[PDB]
């Protein structure tokens, strides 16, 4: 069903995460963490304090798909265990030092071909597949994009709801 999902998405903020590689998205699915550059680190830290849920929607570059989406459960933190990201060319581990804890809501893929009818008012009404890392997605677009994903029966939204 979709009722607990819709409850989680009600009045959420949505952000596009564009991973350069698959390795870090698999790590993020395994460990429930994400790290971004400080400009997006600041944006997400602000959004986490402002909304009942902040949803990150992942897509790895060149894949033609989204790989799932997750909810921020914390602000970024520095000083923990060095998460072994595959660091992109031009990105240092000090830049990715901020670590967000995330709860996955769906780890299933969605091909871009299935989101062609959805455009983002905060990105000039471009198809929602188009955007740089950190691009905020408007409420209705983001909600409808999340509802397009195949349900992930492995995930129980009860624990997620217990953090809102
Ligand atoms: C886990 N950190 C990352 N991994 C892969 N690509 C990225 C692109 C922009 C910012 C952060 C990235």
**Ligand 1 neighbour 133 (Cβ under 6 A):** yes
Task: Kindly report the protein residue whose alpha carbon is nearest to atom 7 of ligand 1.
Answer: 19
Return the ∠ at Cα 24 (arms to 69 and 119), rounded to 5°.
35
d(CA 81, CA 85): 12
Regarding the beta carbon of 96 and ligand 1, being less than 6 Å apart is answered yes
Gap between the Cα atoms of 68 and 109, Å rounded? 6
Overall resolution, Å = 1.8
**Technique of determination:** X-ray
* Cβ atoms of 45 and 75 closer than 8 Å: yes
Q: Is ligand 1 within 6 A of the CB of residue 59? A: no
Tokens linked to 83: 């998460």
The best mutation among 36, 62, 90, 97 to test binding of ligand 1, ranked by most ligand atoms within 8 Å of the C-beta, falls on 36
Going from the N-terminus, what domains does the chain have, and what CATH number goes with each? Answer: 1-164 (3.10.590.10)
Go through 18-49 and write b for each residue having 16 or more CB atoms within 10 A of its CB, e for each that does not.
ebbbeebbebbbeeebbbbeeebbebbbebbe
b/e sequence 99-110, b meaning 16+ C-beta within 10 Å: bbbbbbbbbbbb
Mutate to test the pocket of ligand 1, among 56, 87, 94, 96 (most ligand atoms within 8 A of CB): 96
Ligand 1 midpoint to CA 121 (Å): 24
């Amino acid at each position: 069903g979709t009722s607990k999902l819709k409850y989680v998405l009600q009045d959420a903020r949505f952000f596009l995460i564009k991973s350069n590689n698959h390795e870090n998205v698999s790590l993020a699915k395994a460990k429930g963490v994400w790290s971004t550059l400080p400009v997006n680190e600041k944006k997400l830290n602000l959004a986490f304090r402002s909304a009942r849920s902040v949803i990150l929607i992942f897509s790895v570059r060149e894949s033609g798909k989204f790989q799932g989406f997750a909810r921020l459960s914390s602000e970024s933190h520095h000083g923990g265990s060095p998460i072994h990201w595959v660091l992109p060319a031009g990105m240092s581990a000090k830049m990715l030092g901020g670590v967000f804890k995330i709860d996955w809501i769906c780890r299933r893929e969605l091909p871009f071909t299935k989101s062609a009818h959805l455009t983002n008012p905060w990105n000039e009404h471009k198809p929602v597949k188009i955007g740089r890392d950190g691009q905020e997605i408007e409420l209705e677009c983001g909600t409808q994009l999340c509802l397009l994903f195949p349900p992930d029966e492995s995930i129980d939204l009860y624990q997620v709801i217990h953090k809102m």
